[PDB]
């Protein structure tokens, strides 16, 4: 959902330690970057998305 002005949160799954991608929205192409960290669980009960 999109409003006139504000902030929107998007949940994403990445395998990159240093992710940098081009998030495409209605028309814009935002460049998103950051840093990720290893998770707690050594073993989980679902396949990797």
């Amino acid at each position: 959902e999109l409003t006139e002005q504000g902030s929107a949160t998007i949940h994403f799954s990445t395998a990159n330690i240093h992710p940098e991608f081009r998030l495409q929205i209605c028309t814009s192409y935002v460049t998103c970057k950051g840093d990720c960290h290893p998770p707690k669980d050594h073993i989980v009960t679902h396949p990797q998305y």
Partner: protein, 50 residues
């Protein structure tokens, strides 16, 4: 998660530390020694009186 620290043996003084995971909220830890007892293993030899 395995954390290790070294708290000085001083009763009545708190020891505050923090556990920082790579991408998780910090975890505060506090240890407050109210009393530290050193009890030697004593065996009776004999008893003396007047």
């Amino acid at each position: 998660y395995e954390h290790a620290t070294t708290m000085p043996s001083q009763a009545g003084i708190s020891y505050n530390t923090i556990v920082n995971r790579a991408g998780y909220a910090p975890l505060p830890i506090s240890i407050t020694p109210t009393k530290i007892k050193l009890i030697p293993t004593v065996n009776l030899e004999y008893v003396t009186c007047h």
